From Swiss-Prot:
Gene3D superfamilies linked: P-loop containing nucleotide triphosphate hydrolases
Crosslink feature (Glycyl lysine isopeptide (Lys-Gly) (interchain with G-Cter in SUMO2)) location: 64, 145
Cofactor(s) listed in the protein's UniProt record: Mg(2+)
High-level lineage: Eukaryota, Metazoa, Chordata, Craniata, Vertebrata
E.C. code: 3.6.5.-
Name this polypeptide is given: GTP-binding nuclear protein Ran
Annotated Small GTPase Ran-type domain residues: 1-164
Superkingdom to which the source organism belongs: Eukaryota
Species annotation: Canis lupus familiaris (Dog)
Annotated localization: Nucleus; Nucleus envelope; Cytoplasm, Cytosol; Cytoplasm
Residues flagged as site, Essential for GTP hydrolysis: 62
Length: 201
């Protein structure tokens, strides 16, 4: 099978568990591995070139108590580092998560996601999101509770791993129905503001 270990990391409380859980089959088929303090969710996605399975590793909360063991990171073939757009500290801690990860796994494709963009009161705006630039990471705004941009990180990663820049998803996996509305106007403003921030580089 055409699988990839994906490591999902970032501060406690940023929405990691909530985000992996959108993918309903992935949630139903998860596998808990107590030796490592993890739930591995098999998130299958279907591309114009067939299926790709991301085995997403979700913590059991130990990130609140400290850093993650070598256990968690080894063999990762990709990753998502998450922060909370309503907390500057969580963004401020991004560099530390990236450093812990690349320590074990040097040349991985990584996406950075700013979560909870459904919240009107946004603290970490596009202009302040610079970490990913010099590190060659993709960035996406995300709202786990509304599925907003759910696919984006996975689609960019599938492209890097398969080596097809044109890959697309032919159908979406069944997702948990949006629990909160993502205001369409905020989405439009934010996507552009990222594009405006990128041209100051
Ligand atoms: N509105 C909103 N709240 C969110 C979102 N993602 C997470 N939260 C809230 O953030 C808290 C932490 O979420 P959790 O998924 O357990 O995160 P984790 O500790 O990083 O794995 C809970 O109150 C979530 O419901 C999001 O997309 N929108
Ligand atoms: Mg969690």
């Amino acid at each position: 099978q055409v699988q990839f270990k994906l490591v999902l990391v970032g501060d406690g409380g940023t929405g990691k568990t909530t985000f992996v859980k959108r993918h309903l089959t992935g949630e139903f088929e998860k596998k808990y591995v107590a030796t490592l303090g993890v739930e591995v969710h098999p998130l299958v996605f279907h591309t114009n070139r067939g299926p790709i399975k991301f085995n997403v590793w979700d913590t059991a909360g130990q990130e609140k108590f400290g850093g993650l063991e070598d256990g968690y990171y080894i063999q990762a073939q990709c990753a998502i580092i998450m922060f909370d757009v309503t907390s500057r500290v969580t963004y401020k801690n991004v560099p530390n998560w990236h450093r812990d990860l690349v320590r074990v796994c040097e040349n991985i494709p990584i996406v950075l996601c700013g979560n909870k963009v459904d919240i009107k009161d946004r603290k970490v705006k596009a202009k302040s999101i610079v970490f990913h630039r010099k590190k060659n990471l993709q960035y996406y705004d995300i709202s786990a509770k509304s599925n907003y941009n759910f696919e984006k990180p996975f689609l960019w990663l599938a492209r890097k791993l398969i080596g097809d820049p044109n890959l697309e998803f032919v159908a979406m996996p069944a997702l948990a129905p949006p629990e909160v509305v993502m205001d369409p106007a905020l989405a439009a403003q934010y996507e552009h503001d990222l594009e405006v921030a990128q041209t100051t580089a």
